[PDB]
Amino acid sequence: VISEKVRKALNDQLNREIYSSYLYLSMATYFDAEGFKGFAHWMKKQAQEELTHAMKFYEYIYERGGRVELEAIEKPPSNWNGIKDAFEAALKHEEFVTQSIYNILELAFEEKDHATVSFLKWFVDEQVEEEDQVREILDLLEK
Amino acid sequence: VISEKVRKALNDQLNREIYSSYLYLSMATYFDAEGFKGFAHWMKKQAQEELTHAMKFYEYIYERGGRVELEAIEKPPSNWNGIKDAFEAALKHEEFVTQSIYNILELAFEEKDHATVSFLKWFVDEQVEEEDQVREILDLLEK
């Protein structure tokens, strides 16, 4: 009942959320190496959140009668130039994930897949809240 | 306080548990595609267990004053020739993970790293219980 085009787009995004989880876990390995246990805990929490996002995509794909194919996960960076540098990389990364989702929203609109449109709008709300949260952390730390 | 040799071996194993989680999630995608929701649920549970194993390795590495480096995760198989074929692949995979851990145990013994020896013995107990559990499932299903 979902086209292969939307199913591929949602599977691509599932794999994107897996990498996002893995990237935040990698930022935690850097924070934990530098002794920033609280920032590392923030990243581990975010890594878990991204994995719960991936599994929401997982179950939606199967609910719409499609299948999930897991792809290779690229090695993430493991070092940044300080706390602020890591969080700016997170913000840039989230902005990319927000763009990726809007492109699925656009495809869903073009195919009049109104169930996918309503499914994705939760993720648009969540990622803007995520982007705002990283911006608030960066603002808190400035200079 | 852990040698680089043991730290590398434990980091290698951390990444091995990440792939194990990802492989069990991949078996779930196959079971879920075939409508075997109960076997898929077994695999998703196992995938979570393997990820909790990886994070036990994560925190132990940092407790012993080392650092974690995350590596690329290879694409897992996504199809098997039936339920039994998938579970035999799981058993073979677990036996490989059990061998990998015994090789760390051996290295820890050679370096008289008695803290690593006691840390790993929990994983040897768990993976034998895991192997036995897959054997019990295969025996239950035979013919």
Sign of the alpha-carbon dihedral angle for B128, B134, B138, B139: positive
Q: At what angle do helices B114-141 and B37-63 cross, to 10 degrees?
A: 170
Q: What is the 3-state secondary structure (H, E, C) of chain B?
A: CCCHHHHHHHHHHHHHHHHHHHHHHHHHHHHHHCCCHHHHHHHHHHHHHHHHHHHHHHHHHHHCCCCCCCCCECCCCCCCCCHHHHHHHHHHHHHHHHHHHHHHHHHHHHCCCHHHHHHHHHHHHHHHHHHHHHHHHHHHHCC
Name beta bridge partners: B73: A73
How crowded is residue B114: how many other Cβ atoms within 10 Å of its Cβ? Answer: 10
User: What is the rounded distance in angstroms from the CA atom of residue A134 to the CA atom of residue A91?
Assistant: 6
**Where along chain A do its domains lie?**
4-141
- Cβ atoms A45, A53 nearer than 8 A: no
Distance to chain A for B99, nearest Cα, Å: 24
Q: Are A94 and A130 in contact (CB under 8 A)?
A: yes
Q: Residue B52 and residue B17: Cα distance in Å, rounded?
A: 9
Distance (Å, rounded) from C-alpha A127 to C-alpha B141? 44
A30: closest CA of chain B, how far (Å) = 8
Q: Which of B62, B63, B74, B79 to mutate to test the interface with A (most CBs of A within 10 A)?
A: B62
Query: What would you measure as the largest C-alpha separation in chain A, in angstroms?
Result: 52
List the determination method.
X-ray
Evaluate whether A50 touches A25 at the Cβ level (below 8 Å): no
Q: Across the interface, do A32 and B68 touch by the CB < 8 Å criterion?
A: yes
Question: Resolution in angstroms, to 1 decimal, for this deposition?
Answer: 2.0
Instruction: Locate the chain A residue with the closest alpha carbon to B28.
Output: A68
Fold (topology level) of A4-141: Ferritin (1.20.1260)
Selected for mutation to probe chain A from B24, B43, B67 (highest A CB count within 10 Å) is B67
